[PDB]
Design a protein around this ligand. Structure first.
Ligand code: UDP
Length: 370
């Protein structure tokens, strides 16, 4: 119809939408779309899974925004124990998990024309997909490098083993290609933006003054704002969906917002003087410069950005600092305040991105290899 199946450790029903959600929306426009949510177990209650609100729907198909969703809940799920001595039990758990898919996965695999595997646990199901439906186009979407999200050795090995057999390896960033053991099926397809951004970004949420925006909780560093708010009393810092509340070190020029619907964030981005990607750590992959969603959204608007030096990457209008280093935070902001707004980055919309995720060979510029 084309029929799509997405395998991911996300669930489609989560309010926090990631890249795979935006792709899945596009898929849902193109045909019947299923989103099979992995790495969820009774153990998932021990540490604190964001999909727990969905638990009473586990192991059943739920429709959500035109997508058939299934949160697979096993008793235990396989994971990186991060103990090299536990690797043989890890491998056993992974093999077991992969050997016991629910019939619902098998049926959906069979019904699909296209199966999209997100980087991560979905790797464990690539071989299975090929056995169930060798006609399905198998599309790996590398939202992350495997080693960065620190998958179990099993997943890395399995990915290396099956990578050549994928129809598509769609890397968010060319920087991910070094750890992908395949070539001819490896493509660059960065994150999309909504087709709509410029419309969403009006009207302005801001009154007079200088407004800085940060959106998102990834590695959120409150210390950035502690320093920045003190150093720039004339700047209002709009801290949206940081995943935490009003840190006691924030000055009064910091406005802390709860989670905001993506569409509503856009005005705050479009009309800001500069944006901030306050990653607490520089222990981040080189690709984060490319794969950062907030930074892409700032870039869409040409919004000058302040971010750690490690995610400035190959980009203009990004002013790097060292986390924990007040002077560098201050120096970066001073620069971002004076930076012109220029749309340097070409940002395909989600539909055009999905086109390329699905059929990168039709868009030969996506090729990462001869
Ligand atoms: O309240 C919020 C916070 C997050 N975001 C969006 O969530 C995405 C991912 O944020 P995150 O910090 O997790 O990742 P990053 O942008 O740094 O990759 C970005 O598109 C933000 O626009 C949002 O729409 N509302």
């Amino acid at each position: 119809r084309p029929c799509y199946l997405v395998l991911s450790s996300h669930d489609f029903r989560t309010p926090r939408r990631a890249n795979i959600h935006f792709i899945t929306d596009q898929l849902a426009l193109r045909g019947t779309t299923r989103f099979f949510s992995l790495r969820y177990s009774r153990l998932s209650r021990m540490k604190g899974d964001m999909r727990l609100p969905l638990d009473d729907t586990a192991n059943t198909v739920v429709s959500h925004n035109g997508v058939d969703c299934y949160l697979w809940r096993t008793t235990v799920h396989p994971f990186n124990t991060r103990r090299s001595w536990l690797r043989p039990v890890e491998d056993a758990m992974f093999r077991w998990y992969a050997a016991h898919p629910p019939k619902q996965l098998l049926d959906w695999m069979r019904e699909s024309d296209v199966i999209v595997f997100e980087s991560g646990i979905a790797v464990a199901f690539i071989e299975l997909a090929k056995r169930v439906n060798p006609a399905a186009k198998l599309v790996y979407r590398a939202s992350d490098g495997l080693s960065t999200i620190n998958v179990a050795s099993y997943i890395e090995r399995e990915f290396d083993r099956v990578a050549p057999t994928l129809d598509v390896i769609a890397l968010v960033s060319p920087a991910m290609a070094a750890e992908v053991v395949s070539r001819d099926n490896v493509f660059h397809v960065g994150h999309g933006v909504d087709h709509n951004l410029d419309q969403l970004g009006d009207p302005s949420p801001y009154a007079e003054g200088i407004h800085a925006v940060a959106v998102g909780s990834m590695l959120f560093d409150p210390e950035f704002f502690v320093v920045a708010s003190k150093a720039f009393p004339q700047v209002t810092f709009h801290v949206i969906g940081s995943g935490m509340g009003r840190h006691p070190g924030y000055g009064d020029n910091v406005i802390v917002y709860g989670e905001m619907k993506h569409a509503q964030t856009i005005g705050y981005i479009k009309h800001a003087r500069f944006g901030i990607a306050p990653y607490a750590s520089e222990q981040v992959p080189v690709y984060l410069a490319d794969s950062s969603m907030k930074l892409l959204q700032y870039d869409f608007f040409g919004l000058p950005a302040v971010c750690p030096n490690a995610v400035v990457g190959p980009y203009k209008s990004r002013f790097g600092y060292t986390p924990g280093n007040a002077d560098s935070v201050i120096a970066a902001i001073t620069q971002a305040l004076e930076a012109p707004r220029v749309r340097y980055r070409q940002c395909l919309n989600w539909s055009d991105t999905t086109d390329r995720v699905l059929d990168p060979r039709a868009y030969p510029e996506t090729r990462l290899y001869p």
